[PDB]
């Protein structure tokens, strides 16, 4: 999924916030991995996305 820079800090067990309450919630016993990378070149345009 695409997210607003700062938000990345929410995608983690026990975190709160809009994304971590109404959009995507992680269980406290989660195991796995998370990859996150900026995509200002593609997902953002000066013409408005």
């Amino acid at each position, epitope marked *: 999924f695409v997210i607003r*820079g700062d938000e990345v800090r929410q995608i983690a067990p026990g975190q709160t916030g809009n994304i971590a309450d109404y959009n995507y919630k992680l269980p406290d016993d989660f195991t796995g991995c998370v990859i996150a990378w900026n995509s*200002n070149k593609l997902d953002s345009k000066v013409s408005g996305n």
Partner: nanobody
Amino acid sequence: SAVQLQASGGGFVQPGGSLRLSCAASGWAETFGHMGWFRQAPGKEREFVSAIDWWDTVHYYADSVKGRFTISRDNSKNTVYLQMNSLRAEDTATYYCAYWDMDYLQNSIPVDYWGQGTQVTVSS
């Protein structure tokens, strides 16, 4: 984690002037943490100068360089920049950009990685 820091800038300057330093980071780390600069005077100990969060929200500066040094971040190059002025003789030293890999900064004692020394010299 595997993070490489590339430093750029430094040279010989006149007192009270301005110069150019910038540090870029590459690789992959645990999280988006803080980034700062460390000063080493010849014959002295290595002390921190400042520390900026990744998202440019909160800034931390040393009491000895407050109001004289500032640090900002790029918007399309992922390279931290810093500006300075009114340089004095004590500023002749070796500077290193360092990456702190935690979300919230508490103190400057634990340092993760270090960059190549950039020697800056000021005199008449």
